[PDB]
Design a protein around this nucleic acid. Structure first.
Ligand SMILES: Nc1ccn([C@H]2C[C@H](O)[C@@H](COP(=O)(O)NP(=O)(O)OP(=O)(O)O)O2)c(=O)n1
Ligand SMILES: [Mg+2]
Ligand SMILES: [Mg+2]
Length: 347
DNA sequence: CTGGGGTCCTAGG
DNA sequence: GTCCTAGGACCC
């Protein structure tokens, strides 16, 4: 009788996984990134525990910066296979509730629920938090609404370890005075372009004439931003499996490369690694992109389409190296990367 | 000093 | 109304 979308987001996800094996660290600053050595150059924070975030540490910070901003933190190496495994357990549990479940990356999911009168979406969200914790030792937060975008926005108010409802009744009261980048997919550059037209809040955006937004942003985007400002969004939760569009690997080197021999050999090794992973997942490559970053932090990406979709190793390597060859490589190289775009024709 | 992994969209020769 | 790459803008 009442249709709800619940958005589950795991709490301090990488840190919470680490905390399962180190329960003595609960309540203490913990910082996941690199190899656990905070003096290591060219490594950053992947996840800071809530306690560490109070010192201003946050994902993407250099570990040496972080250690200097939270000297008593315990530094743990990033363990991806453990986060992957913990994700799968989380999705596998959420699926068994008998509601449509749309997974998004490792640590989020949307759930669609049509509730009779006797129930209450808040109490469905508490049994989600309870089932997850009991079975997996992970805490999560749950935002509630009638569309995905607004539920996801609610989840930021539910953090940490909580539940929050955001609907047409409180959308204006709660987020009207907030800047437009409180909305999903509006960031700093859209914000700046909005500020230029005199729009500095959600409520201001919500009442903007459509043709100002359609002229500035396109006839479908401009209306979408209106919709977002008014608290609307996607209402369908599809259980259909996500098909990745690409896969990539990049490596920042412990010291910058100057031998071209080594740059080639690294791109060749990244192309081979990425290809074997997509072939294992049953995929076919369509385009091949190479990324190069110098010691300047000068970074560019070039891409080329295969004549036809293929999985051929010798062809994809030659293509990547060919694309590599289109860069002037007269500066030391800090990073190299390869990305393989993938066919989405027939699964 | 400044990681690694993604998506979606528009500008444009 | 083509088929292509570049790259901006976000996000986890
Ligand atoms: N720049 C970033 C952002 C997130 N991540 C990883 C680490 C996070 O634990 C994971 C989930 O992203 P997230 O949900 O934005 N933050 P997280 O779960 O750590 O904390 P809260 O959701 O409770 O705020 O993606 C990363 O590797 N690099
Ligand atoms: Mg999270
Ligand atoms: Mg998340």
């Amino acid at each position: 009788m009442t249709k709800w979308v619940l958005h589950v987001d795991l709490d301090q996800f990488y840190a919470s996984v680490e905390l399962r094996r180190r329960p003595d660290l609960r309540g203490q600053p913990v910082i996941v990134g690199g190899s656990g050595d905070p003096s290591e150059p060219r490594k950053v924070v992947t996840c800071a525990s809530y306690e560490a975030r109070e010192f201003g540490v946050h994902a993407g910070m250099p570990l040496r910066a972080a250690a200097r901003r939270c000297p008593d933190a315990t530094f743990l190496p990033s363990d991806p296979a453990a986060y992957d495994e913990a994700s799968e357990q989380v999705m596998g549990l959420l699926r068994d509730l008998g509601h449509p479940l749309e997974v998004w990356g490792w640590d989020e999911a949307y759930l669609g629920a049509d509730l009779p009168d006797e129930s209450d979406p808040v109490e469905v969200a508490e049994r989600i938090r309870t089932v997850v914790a009991a079975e997996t030792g992970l805490s999560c937060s749950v935002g509630i609404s009638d569309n995905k975008q607004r539920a996801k926005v609610a989840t930021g108010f539910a953090k940490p370890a909580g539940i929050y409802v955001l609907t047409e009744a409180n959308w204006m009261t709660v987020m009207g005075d907030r800047p437009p980048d409180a909305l999903w997919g509006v960031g700093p550059k859209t914000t700046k372009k909005l500020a230029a037209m005199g729009i500095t809040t959600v409520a201001d955006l919500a009442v903007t004439d459509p043709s100002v937004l359609t002229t500035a942003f396109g006839p479908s985007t401009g209306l979408w931003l209106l919709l977002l400002a008014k608290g609307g969004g996607d209402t369908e939760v599809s259980s259909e499996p996500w098909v990745p569009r690409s896969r990539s690997h990049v490596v920042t080197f412990p010291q910058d490369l100057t031998e071209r021999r080594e740059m080639d050999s690294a791109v060749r090794d990244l192309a081979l690694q990425t290809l074997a992973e997509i072939v294992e997942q049953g995929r076919i490559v369509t385009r091949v992109a190479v990324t190069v970053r110098t010691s300047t932090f000068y970074t560019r990406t070039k891409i080329r389409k295969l004549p036809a979709p293929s999985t051929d190793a010798g062809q994809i390597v030659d293509t990547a190296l060919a694309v590599l060859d289109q860069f002037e490589l007269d500066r030391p190289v800090r990073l190299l990367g390869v990305r393989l775009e993938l066919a989405m024709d027939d699964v």
